[PDB]
């Protein structure tokens, strides 16, 4: 019956931005008014649709992209943006339809001993295509000479950690970001609001 929005937004451990989980939501009724009017969300920005028409609208598929980014990087999850995350970790298409949802997760992800589990891609040969998922751990070739699998000068580990601390400012706190992508195609609109 009801769509499993609760599982996506209450998951105990979220994924890293570089490898972002893709869940397709179908064959259920989607209640949006519980999320929209919640007092636990910090960001709720919709692109291409109006924030209140979601209940009326019917879509073929809803895709929930769940990734952890740093506070200052929340503004990069939008169409037509650049940056370390926007270009190398998670790229949105220019004709994006959906809502970008984010909330402060400082009391859940940050550790006093240092949270290093979260990672982000720092070096890539080229920028990502929309909804491209790059999970390669291949050594970055900065120069014209081969690395041969060994690090050092001009051969670096492409991933980098965040290092979340409880004493950091708001701009460096972890924030969980769920992106609900609305895809419509020539199929019955099995997803519809109440």
């Amino acid at each position: 019956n009801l769509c499993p929005f609760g599982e996506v937004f209450n998951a105990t451990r979220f994924a890293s931005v570089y490898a972002w989980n893709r869940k397709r939501i179908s064959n259920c009724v989607a209640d949006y008014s519980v999320l929209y009017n919640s007092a636990s969300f910090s960001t709720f920005k919709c692109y291409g649709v109006s924030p209140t028409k979601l209940n009326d609208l019917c879509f073929t598929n809803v895709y929930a992209d769940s990734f952890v980014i740093r506070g200052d990087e929340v503004r990069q999850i939008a169409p037509g943006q650049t940056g370390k995350i926007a270009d190398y970790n998670y790229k949105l298409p220019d004709d994006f339809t959906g809502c970008v949802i984010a909330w402060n997760s400082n009391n859940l992800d940050s550790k006093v001993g240092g949270n290093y589990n979260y990672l982000y891609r720092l070096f890539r040969k080229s920028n990502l295509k929309p909804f491209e998922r790059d999970i390669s751990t291949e050594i970055y070739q900065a120069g014209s000479t081969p690395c041969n699998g060994v690090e050092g000068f001009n051969c670096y580990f492409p991933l980098q950690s965040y290092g979340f601390q409880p004493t950091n400012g708001v701009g460096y706190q972890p924030y969980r970001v769920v992106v609900l992508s609305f895809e419509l195609l020539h199929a019955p609109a099995t997803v519809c609001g109440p």
Partner: antibody
Amino acid sequence: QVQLVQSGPEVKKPGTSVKVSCKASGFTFSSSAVQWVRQARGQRLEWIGWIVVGSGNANYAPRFQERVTITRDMSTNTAYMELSSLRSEDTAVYYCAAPNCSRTLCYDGFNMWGQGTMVTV
Amino acid sequence: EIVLTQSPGSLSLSPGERATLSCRASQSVRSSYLGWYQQKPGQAPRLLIYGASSRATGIPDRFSGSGSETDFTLTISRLEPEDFAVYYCQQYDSSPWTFGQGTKVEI
């Protein structure tokens, strides 16, 4: 005109800690990495340690590993090096050098060098 | 610690003839991860070659390099008056990146 402009010379008493920095301009600093070397007057060059500014991973030579903290500030395109417990023999000219790095690709050698700063203890 | 032996310590040679400089490594070093620097007196060093045999930009054709696993050689075809300086080799293969003793070329 890709250069690396550091600060001027300093003369400090023994036991204090000195802060040295190099400010990059004209090229993409984040892709590149900075190596720190020192050369006393009339002697050879000694390698303090290098840092990749983008990653922030700092490697230090074994002799000076305990006493050097090599940090970077990406916002101002500046690499910092700090020496503690300055002893009389530590007086030397300190250099910083980074490869000319474009966004897509980097130069295989350490092309750009600094002007050199004298530190007297 | 990869000690870089340098021979000879000093070199006295007239301009116009050939010169052979030697950078000796304690153990084998990757050819690509090496560079040569010219330090003029009272000046910063300046890179001439990288990867043993690949000349860097802005250096004339006279300077040349020979590559091998444990032997590295720099050769100057024609000595010029401004080319008399202390030359240093560096290995980027393994940390620490040591420097050689330095060979001074004079007349």
